Design an enzyme around this catalytic site. Structure first.
Site, mmCIF file in Angstrom:
data_model
loop_
_atom_site.group_PDB
_atom_site.id
_atom_site.type_symbol
_atom_site.label_atom_id
_atom_site.label_comp_id
_atom_site.label_asym_id
_atom_site.label_seq_id
_atom_site.Cartn_x
_atom_site.Cartn_y
_atom_site.Cartn_z
ATOM 1 C CG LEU A 77 0.889 0.943 5.813
ATOM 2 C CD1 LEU A 77 1.467 0.051 6.886
ATOM 3 C CD2 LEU A 77 1.961 1.673 5.050
ATOM 4 C CG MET A 81 -7.427 4.828 5.374
ATOM 5 S SD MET A 81 -6.692 4.615 3.737
ATOM 6 C CE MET A 81 -5.003 5.496 3.953
ATOM 7 C CE1 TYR A 105 -10.400 -1.889 4.970
ATOM 8 C CE2 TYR A 105 -11.576 -1.009 6.873
ATOM 9 C CZ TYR A 105 -10.411 -1.150 6.146
ATOM 10 O OH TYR A 105 -9.258 -0.585 6.649
ATOM 11 C CD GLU A 153 -13.848 1.900 9.092
ATOM 12 O OE1 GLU A 153 -13.285 1.172 8.256
ATOM 13 O OE2 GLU A 153 -14.825 2.615 8.809
ATOM 14 C CE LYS A 188 -7.128 -3.256 8.061
ATOM 15 N NZ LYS A 188 -5.798 -3.295 7.383
ATOM 16 N N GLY A 198 0.869 -1.175 0.000
ATOM 17 C CA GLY A 198 0.000 0.000 0.000
ATOM 18 C C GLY A 198 0.919 1.243 0.000
ATOM 19 C CB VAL A 199 4.368 1.719 -1.400
ATOM 20 C CG1 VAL A 199 4.179 1.759 -2.904
ATOM 21 C CG2 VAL A 199 5.594 2.568 -0.965
ATOM 22 C CB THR A 200 0.808 4.806 -4.142
ATOM 23 O OG1 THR A 200 -0.362 3.985 -4.244
ATOM 24 C CG2 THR A 200 1.952 4.209 -4.983
ATOM 25 N N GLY A 201 -0.461 5.001 -0.885
ATOM 26 C CA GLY A 201 -1.515 5.690 -0.161
ATOM 27 C C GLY A 201 -0.937 6.808 0.731
#
Lengths: 335, 335
Positions: B64, B67, B135, B113, B139, B8-11
């Site tokens: 990651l 979210m 979702y 959440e 998690k 998730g490196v570009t979030g």
């Protein structure tokens, strides 16, 4: 009775075509993008779709996909091409694999977005294509593979080059539904302003119900042929706004030009627009999207009329009235 | 030097964590959801990710994902679970397959959440989970599989239960970015009104930069441990609006209660809010989203402070100022 398979069965066009065909007594099978049957699948799996065609043995197949590059925003380019371009080849190849060339007639839903650049106006069957988005290139392939299976194997396969067509089911991303939804919410006091681009922009808007009918007609002929499907009549975005507002008793006045243009409420008749009063500014232009672009999409449906006798029966005002009424109903559940 | 892999490196969080680690001299490898390396993959392919871990031999892995259930809106439930739940198992299993239990430390990004219902306030590490969306269930699995590999194999694996954290990179779907974007556009005359829900709603907002730092700290210890990552301070949506407006010289007055509440412009200082004048109504409530819901998310970061010495260093006002400035810059490119 007759059997039909519809791909993209839950979209605006698919839902209306399914109704149209059921009314005629067809047994209708569909896949997403009583005598109605839903199947799992999206056209990316050759084995699954061939199996479905094998079980269904359809007399007619309607390959409807996505109608706009904007409706395809959240998909990866590869996925869109795999289903809208390759999916078309898979359907045609399955019809051949199963020996259905003589029983199954094939219809492919093209789009006016194939014209991209434009140049000549109005656009007709002979007007050259020039795709401007990955989505449109995928559709170009679908158009040509369909022509090729027709010409190479003598299969009954044809393309419907569709120009804009709306209805109460039209996706909220298109400008027509954006306008009717906004006008209703404003009239009901749930919002205050509607921001648009150049209100001079001219469009060719038809009703999805009339268009799915032409699609069906295109498979009832003796020989397969391609057709432009449009109204050939222009209206401005601004006229669309006026019409939508008029459905709720709101008369508008436009002051200013270009990005400065604004829609002012002159008078209000009736009891459906309680959240609006004379003097109110409810339409304005968003500079981020304003653009004075020439060269305009306008289809010439003459061939459709001449060879098939097809003509749009629903008027633009009836379409706007229907869309406004549906959005007004949703809106008052919240005022 | 040290090597890290970030999924998730570009979030928002991934981009900030990558910066944080590069600054420390790490060689950073990433996959989407100089000494920086991007790889193809999304955690759905065991072979591809094991190959990547085998080539990278990371000292640290930061799992990651998405979210929020809202940031995952356009994915299918199965795809979300495959990458956010199963993807976590694949990463842990690959670390074992490759014999990296002793070299690689694993961090998993949980979310507030997981508390769903809530009940007790504030929420801490011992507060029970009760997921309210598919979702969040995915998690929940990611949280527990991480605890299980820690307890069963003695692996250095831990969970960061993250509460809301923003920044100029925060997605436009979250309310904080919605507010700063809207206030800037209104001040610059590109829009006219901001519609929100209950403005009394209380939130715990921190800065993504402070949180990615705690994530890194959580892997520098002698033993793995889970932690709630939050500020533990509450602010109302209404206060957030006031603060954002104050960054542009706009003082607000609030008249009315509940769905009737409105934000009126009292005064304007400076030259960044030309599109606003005293008397203007620029904040209103949308009944469709108004809801007087109790029982409130508020994290208790005491353990983080006690065991690690971590505390948020950036204040809410500096965060708002940074977000407003970034949105103001984009906005004036269009006034």
């Amino acid at each position: 009775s007759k059997v039909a398979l519809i791909t993209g069965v839950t979209g605006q066009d698919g839902s209306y075509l399914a109704e149209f065909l059921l009314e005629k007594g067809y047994e209708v099978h569909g896949i997403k993008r009583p005598k109605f049957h839903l199947h799992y699948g999206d056209l990316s799996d050759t084995s699954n779709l061939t199996r479905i065609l094998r079980e269904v043995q359809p007399d007619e197949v309607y390959n409807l996909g996505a109608m706009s590059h904007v409706a395809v925003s959240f998909e990866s380019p590869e996925y869109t091409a795999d289903v809208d371009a390759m999916g078309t080849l898979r359907l045609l190849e399955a019809i051949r694999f199963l020996g259905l060339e003589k029983k199954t007639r094939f219809y492919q839903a093209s789009t006016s977005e194939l014209y991209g650049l434009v140049q000549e106006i109005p656009q007709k069957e002979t007007t050259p294509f020039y795709p401007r988005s990955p989505y449109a290139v995928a559709k170009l392939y679908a158009y040509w593979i369909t022509v090729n299976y027709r010409e190479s194997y003598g299969m009954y396969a044809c393309n419907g080059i569709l120009f804009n067509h709306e209805s109460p089911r039209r996706g909220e991303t298109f400008v027509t539904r954006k306008i009717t939804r906004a006008i209703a919410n404003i009239a009901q006091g749930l919002e205050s302003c509607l921001y648009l681009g150049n209100m001079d922009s001219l469009r060719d808007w038809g009703h999805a119900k009339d268009y799915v009918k032409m699609q069906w007609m295109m498979l009832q002929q003796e020989q397969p042929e391609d057709f432009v499907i449009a109204t050939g009549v222009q209206y401005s975005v601004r006229q669309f706004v006026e019409m939508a507002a008029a459905q709720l008793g709101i008369k508008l006045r436009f002051e200013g030009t270009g990005v400065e243009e604004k829609g002012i409420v002159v008078s209000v008749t009736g009891h459906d627009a309680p959240g609006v009063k004379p003097g109110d500014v409810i339409i304005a232009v968003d500079p981020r999207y304003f653009r004075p672009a020439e060269e305009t999409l306008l289809g010439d449906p003459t061939k459709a009329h001449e060879k098939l006798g097809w003509k749009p029966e629903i008027t633009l005002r009836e379409m706007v009235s229907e869309m406004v009424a549906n959005d007004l109903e949703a809106a008052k559940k919240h005022s």
